[PDB]
């Protein structure tokens, strides 16, 4: 039912410009804040920008401040990211996502190639296990964040998916072998019995304070 369809990526020279589009369907687009999150090749997820329902409030990561502009056209159910003065450091897959701080749906990602914060730390950074094993992943916040903690799963080549929100709530449709626990500064995601489709990188993310930050990712290999 919910789809976020991205377009507009490509290859540009340093200093160049691109515009990304994210077409939404299956939910009431104008009722939700919308966001952009990027991922440089082989690296973790990084929040880039967000925009309120009617466009009056926007936010940008410090590194793109003044060069990127987020906008939306509610009458076309479309979110945009205008990217000027592109730098090598901007090379990444760009995801749009629904909501401000709990990203319950993600676009498929579009590749752009140019050629005080709350720190989240995950343990382990990677692990190799076998079908049927129990896996636990720890996420620590550098300050107390109560229950404002989400978990995402990202299979190789794919967009992230929300698994757990607000520390312990199972997102609709997620298998019950996934569970979340914890509070304050220490949180855990548990996969009670690892299935073959669970090989993926898992990310925690605090939803309480700007700028939004992700853990570095835990790669679960088989």
Numbering used by the authors: 3 to 117, 134 to 240
What's the paper's own text on this?
M2 ectodomain (M2e) is a potential universal candidate for monoclonal antibody therapy owing to its conserved nature across influenza virus subtypes and its importance in viral propagation. We selected a 10-mer conserved epitope of the N-terminal region of the M2 ectodomain as SLLTEVETPI (labeled U1) used for screening against the Tomlinson (I + J) scFv phage libraries. Four distinct clones (AU1, GU1, JU1, and UU1) were obtained based on changes in the CDR regions.
The scFv GU1 was crystallized in 4 % MPD, 0.5 M sodium citrate at pH 3.5, 20 % PEG 1500 in the apo form for which the data were collected at a resolution of 1.9 Å resolution. A comparative structural analysis of liganded scFv AU1 with unliganded scFvs AU1 and GU1 and models of scFvs JU1 and UU1 was carried out. All the scFvs superimpose with RMSD ranging from 0.358 Å to 0.498 Å. Interestingly, no significant conformational differences could be observed in CDR conformations. Interestingly, the other three scFvs, did not show reduction of viral gene transcripts in the medium, although they bind to the M2 protein with comparable affinities. It is possible that antibody scFvs, other than AU1 do not form similar dimeric interactions with the epitope and that could explain their inability to inactivate the virus.
